[PDB]
Design an enzyme around this catalytic site. Structure first.
Site, PDB file in Angstrom:
ATOM      1  N   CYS A  12       0.902  -1.235  -0.006  1.00 55.29           N
ATOM      2  CA  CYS A  12      -0.004  -0.055  -0.110  1.00 55.29           C
ATOM      3  C   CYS A  12       0.791   1.187  -0.003  1.00 55.29           C
ATOM      4  O   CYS A  12       0.833   2.023  -0.934  1.00 55.29           O
ATOM      5  CB  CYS A  12      -0.741   0.005   1.370  1.00 55.29           C
ATOM      6  SG  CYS A  12      -1.403  -1.543   1.956  1.00 55.29           S
ATOM      7  N   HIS A 254      -4.826   0.605   5.658  1.00 53.18           N
ATOM      8  CA  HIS A 254      -4.390   0.417   4.285  1.00 53.18           C
ATOM      9  C   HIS A 254      -4.266   1.977   3.768  1.00 53.18           C
ATOM     10  O   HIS A 254      -4.739   2.862   4.588  1.00 53.18           O
ATOM     11  CB  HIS A 254      -5.695  -0.283   3.471  1.00 53.18           C
ATOM     12  CG  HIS A 254      -5.618   0.095   2.102  1.00 53.18           C
ATOM     13  ND1 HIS A 254      -4.568  -0.355   1.301  1.00 53.18           N
ATOM     14  CD2 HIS A 254      -6.562   0.290   1.073  1.00 53.18           C
ATOM     15  CE1 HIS A 254      -4.709  -0.204   0.091  1.00 53.18           C
ATOM     16  NE2 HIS A 254      -6.084   0.140   0.040  1.00 53.18           N
TER      17      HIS A 254
END
Ligand SMILES: [Zn+2]
Lengths: 343, 75
Positions: A12, A254
């Site tokens: 990410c 995330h």
């Protein structure tokens, strides 16, 4: 219409970082025209960074699988673990440091583009002395808890602190600890100014890090004047080009980014924004910047019940104020051209 | 010699260290004063993150050099 970056499992942070570097044109062209040497450090990475940056630009496909990049990327001492969640601002310093260390051409580019100088000054209350020094920086951390905006943060970053008690100075010209008031301020601001809104506190009762979700706003255009060494002791107006949002809690989360297209002059002149989420890039309506990045509380109509927003900005990207031609290795263009032909 | 530390809340503190102290020592001494376990800490001096196993001297940091304490919003 943009090319994304495939998630290898837990990259990410990497996608967010590569895409933001890619969207700053000075740095895209800098990585492109970098001249390969033999004994240059991180040769394989600059090489893999170039193929990625070219694929991002000229490829007809949806996403570039960044595995060739990641298999040669080394972090601290060991090779990169594509399954390990990482701090985006950490990976950002890691990569900007490498690029700086590659060639003195790049170092002068990186420092001028992303680097700045804080001058913090100590003055003694029970002495006749003074010791102002210099500090180098790339990213400026901002207090978020008990702050309503980034102007409040900068007001605290450049505050007049009083060194007293358990934290007395030690005047070096006096061999004794002294009452002193120290304050930092910015001497050289970078062209691309990065902030790190640290959205966490360490809870002392529970011995645990605790993600901060309070409301924290930042302007679309920023005026850095009240924190320059010229005001205390070229232009200082900046434009927001990038936000790096972290969704989730302190145990892990995330990442994704809202980056401004500052390349295409028509997109730039009409404030077109885009959501970069791994292998997915979509247009983004800047009307919802505040909701998506500022934090606070949301309401819904669950069945009415209001929770705290666990998605908020972890990193801000501003470009200083003042139709790009990129020179990319023709051998690389034919690479991308061959692959493009199938789609 | 004494260095400066901008802690997690932006508080400037002071640390009496010797340049031959290792980074893990500094994280231990930071734990002593501001109470944060050494393994959760990152320390950023002048842009370069200090890594465990090297010497406070290996980064060429001296008196009045400022260390920056951060955690990891590790996503
Ligand atoms: Zn003195």
């Amino acid at each position: 219409r943009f090319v994304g970056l495939t998630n290898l499992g837990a990259t990410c942070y990497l996608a967010s970082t590569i895409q933001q570097l890619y969207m700053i044109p000075e740095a895209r062209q800098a990585v492109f025209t970098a001249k390969y040497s033999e004994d240059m450090k991180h040769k394989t990475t600059l090489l893999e960074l170039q193929k990625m940056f070219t694929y991002l630009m000229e490829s007809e496909c949806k996403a570039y699988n960044p595995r060739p990049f990641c298999k040669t990327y080394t972090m601290d001492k060991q090779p990169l673990n594509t399954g390990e969640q990482k701090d985006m601002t950490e990976f950002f310093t890691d990569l900007i440091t490498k690029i700086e260390e590659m060639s003195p051409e790049l170092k002068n580019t990186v420092k001028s583009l992303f680097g700045g100088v804080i001058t913090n000054n100590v003055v003694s209350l029970d002495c006749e002395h003074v010791s102002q020094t210099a500090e180098e920086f790339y990213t400026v951390r901002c207090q978020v808890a008990d702050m309503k905006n980034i102007y409040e943060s900068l007001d605290e970053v450049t505050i007049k602190d009083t060194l007293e008690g358990d934290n007395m100075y030690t005047c070096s010209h006096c061999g004794k600890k002294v009452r002193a008031e120290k304050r930092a301020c910015f001497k050289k601001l970078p062209r691309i100014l990065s902030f790190n809104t640290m959205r966490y506190t360490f809870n002392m009762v529970t011995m645990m890090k605790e993600k901060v979700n309070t409301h924290f706003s930042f302007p679309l255009r920023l005026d850095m004047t009240p924190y320059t060494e010229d005001f205390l002791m070229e232009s200082y107006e900046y434009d927001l080009i990038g936000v790096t949002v972290h969704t989730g809690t302190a145990d892990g989360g995330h990442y994704y980014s809202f980056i401004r297209d500052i390349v295409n002059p028509h997109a730039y002149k009409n404030n077109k924004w885009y959501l970069f989420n791994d292998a997915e890039v979509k247009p983004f309506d800047s009307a919802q910047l505040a909701s998506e990045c500022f934090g606070g509380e949301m309401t819904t109509k669950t069945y009415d019940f209001s929770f705290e927003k666990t998605h908020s900005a972890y990193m801000l990207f501003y470009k200083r104020m003042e139709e790009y031609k990129f020179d990319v290795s023709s051998e690389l263009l034919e690479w991308i051209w061959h692959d493009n032909m199938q789609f | 010699m004494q260095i400066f530390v901008k802690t997690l809340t932006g508080k400037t503190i002071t640390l009496e260290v010797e340049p031959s102290d290792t980074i893990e020592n500094v994280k231990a001494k930071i734990q002593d004063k501001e109470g944060i376990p050494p393994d959760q800490q990152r320390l950023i001096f002048a842009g370069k993150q200090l890594e465990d196993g090297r010497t406070l001297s290996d980064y060429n940091i001296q008196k009045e050099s400022t260390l920056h304490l951060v955690l990891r919003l590790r996503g």
